[PDB]
Amino acid sequence: QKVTQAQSSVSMPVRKAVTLNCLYETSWWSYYIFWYKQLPSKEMIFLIRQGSDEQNAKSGRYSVNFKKAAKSVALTISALQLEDSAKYFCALGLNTDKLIFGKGTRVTVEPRSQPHTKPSVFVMKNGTNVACLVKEFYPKDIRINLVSSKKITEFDPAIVISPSGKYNAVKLGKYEDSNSVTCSVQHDNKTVHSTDFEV
Amino acid sequence: QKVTQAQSSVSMPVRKAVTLNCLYETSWWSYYIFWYKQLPSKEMIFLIRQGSDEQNAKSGRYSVNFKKAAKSVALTISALQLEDSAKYFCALGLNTDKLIFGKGTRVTVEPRSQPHTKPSVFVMKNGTNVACLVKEFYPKDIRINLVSSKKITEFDPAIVISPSGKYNAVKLGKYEDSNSVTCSVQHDNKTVHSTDFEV
Amino acid sequence: TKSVTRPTRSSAEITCDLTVINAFYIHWYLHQEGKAPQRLLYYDVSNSKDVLESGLSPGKYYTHTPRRWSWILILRNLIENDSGVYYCATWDYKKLFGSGTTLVVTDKQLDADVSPKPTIFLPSIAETKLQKAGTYLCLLEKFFPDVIKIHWQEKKSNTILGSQEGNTMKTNDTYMKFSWLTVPEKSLDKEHRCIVRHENNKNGVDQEIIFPP
Amino acid sequence: TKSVTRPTRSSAEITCDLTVINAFYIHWYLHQEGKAPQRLLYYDVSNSKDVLESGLSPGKYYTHTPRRWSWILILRNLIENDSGVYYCATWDYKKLFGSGTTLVVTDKQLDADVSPKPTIFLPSIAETKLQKAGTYLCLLEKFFPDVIKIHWQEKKSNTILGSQEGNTMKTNDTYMKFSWLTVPEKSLDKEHRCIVRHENNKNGVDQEIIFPP
């Protein structure tokens, strides 16, 4: 009774398709294979169930490819979306029975192709904490360095997908003077300061 | 390992003495005998401890008579009071050990000798409930019958010792009219009504 | 002391108030009517394991420590012959005991509200001249677990007044108690209370019946 | 989902929110990092007994039913290798799961207050002309169990606003998170909230940070 998933991570863009592999192994004669997904808020949701006696089970945007002669089963998620970013588990399995899970594969969904836009950075203070705010920009090649002669801490930027399909980033940093600090950006071969917005 | 107490109840008046018996039985060579008392609010209080190797243990108003040749041990409560009305337990018995208790004897302490007084009854209503109230009287020979042609319920009287050393009694009773009801008392060969107090 | 009124085939939590720093073993005793207090088990606290008696299999008694130096005995699969008073004990010599907790195991024969319902009384008019005093009366009724405590307090004080209770008489399936108090002459027209402690009170907080002049 | 932060050699209560009428068996799963969800035990409810795994002796896991149809898994004698996410499950086919409960087992290395402490930010002055919008920023810090949930609400509504969080970055022994929200033009000068759910949040009630115009 073993379930093997030798896939660490996958990256597939929006409205494409993805196949996930699951090598089960058992000695029973009639079993079921369940598929579960785990949100980052730690919730398990039943996706699809493949009974090992009748043909391929599909339910909406999910499809299961079953190789009974081999030991391979495969989940298809067609027409991907933005909340298909989870961790997916293969389970093997009347009220007393247990499910045997695999180690789980992670699907990270990337946005589509967009023309390049420009950052338009800002800055905001709280006495000693600063925060450079970068507005929407499509390619993820960003460098959000700040300017201060007196540096204490500088955490990493946090790039996240906007609801427009582009990216936003915040980079915190604690300094002493915290008033003569102005952030800069090296996005897409053209430097963007924050003094042109100031006046 | 047995502890026997063949005494169901004792009645002894105030500032007298009482002996309680406890027949233990064991095969150990060195043991202790503890005495506990239980209030009616279910609290166990350690009274006295008799070590079976040295002489008789006394602590204040408690004394223990020890017969090592026989199997008899005996607690003395000298100069009785009014809060010596409990249930007393004999126990037999380093942090892991257990105590073996007996079935327990009950001591009910009676007040002293007083001259006879007279009841002086009253009455109090709540629409349908009545309650004859009897003030202080020393000998407990009371009969607190009420008068009504229309009787529904009549609970028993509750005779309790007053802080003066005499007795008070309440007898409830539910009736319909509940306004023309007057209680009477047959205490000590002289009947006491409740119409002489009314005017 | 309080009461616990679980039904049959259920679970019951029995906590003891005996607060002791750096204990080693916590014993558990059971007292039933006309019998002796016997030890059920004792709980090692440096190893966290129960040592039972020679009478039953495991899966009945469990000692739970929710915080440090606090213990709860959990009973499981309650039968009607499990009802009694439960103490907890520790050695020091003497053996201290832990104020008792009555457990009542019923067959869910309540079917209504079983809170104590007062029907308070007022002193008579003829008592308040020829005695220079007056007496209250605070009759409670229709309450099931019978571990009830009536005590009287002043209008604003922390004194316990000289009340004189009665016996917890039993109706056909419920119970009934009454307490009463006599107050002297120059403390007569004030406020008085008939605080009633019980398990099946509303919101857990015990009642507080206010008495007129 | 929440967190539990008991120390070593202690007891932990793990309750699950999965409310099901007329269950028969309640399974209990454990998920650790880079491993699979394995079943620890399952609790019969018509007989009230635990059936364990092939790995440990009894005296570690106990299933407690405080009320009818409510279950708590009590762990005993906690070791540092007991930490993970605990689910409860029932069959129906499919097998429903119970939203998880992280348990963190530490060596009492906190030694201070570990509540999330906000240091909120205000939109820049130049953003509020050439964008017709403004952005808040709600930085939290110094909180240990790391199961935290920041969501933004309106001044008086029940809507969840389009916040955009960041990664729970780790300081030398504590943690730090920040969330931020962009609001449009004609809903700008109102009040906004930065509700923060956490375990070591004072009085149990979660925070509620009010944001100016």
Author numbering:
A (entry chain m), B (entry chain M): 22 to 114, 119 to 224
C (entry chain N), D (entry chain n): 11 to 102, 111 to 231
Paper text:
Gamma delta (γδ) T cells, a unique T cell subgroup, are crucial in various immune responses and immunopathology. The γδ TCR is a heterodimer comprising TCRγ and TCRδ chains, discovered in the mid 1980s9–12. Each TCRγ or TCRδ contains an extracellular domain (ECD) with a Vγ/Cγ or Vδ/Cδ domain, a membrane-proximal connecting peptide (CP), a transmembrane (TM) helix and a short cytoplasmic tail. After antigen engagement, the γδ TCR–CD3 complex triggers the phosphorylation of ITAMs within the cytoplasmic tails of CD3 subunits, initiating downstream events.
To achieve a higher resolution, we performed focused refinements for the ECD, MPD–TMD, as well as the individual MPDI–TMDI and MPDII–TMDII. This yielded four additional 3D reconstructions at resolutions of 3.0 Å, 5.3 Å, 3.9 Å and 3.9 Å, respectively. The high-quality cryo-EM map for the ECD enabled us to build an atomic model. The ECDI and ECDII, interacting through their Vγ5 domains, are oriented perpendicularly and elevated over the membrane by around 50 Å. Examination of the Vγ5I–Vγ5II interface reveals intricate interactions, primarily involving a pair of interlocked Tyr106 and Arg120 residues. Tyr106 and Arg120 in Vγ5I interact with the opposite Arg120 and Tyr106 in Vγ5II, resulting in cation–π and π–π interactions among the four residues (Arg-Tyr-Tyr-Arg). Furthermore, the guanidinium group of Arg120 in one Vγ5 domain donates three hydrogen bonds to Ser92, Asp94 and Thr107 in the other Vγ5 domain. On the opposite side of the Arg-Tyr-Tyr-Arg cluster, a pair of hydrogen bonds formed by Glu57 and His108 is also observed. We found that the Vγ5I–Vγ5II interface primarily involves HV4, with some contributions from CDR2.
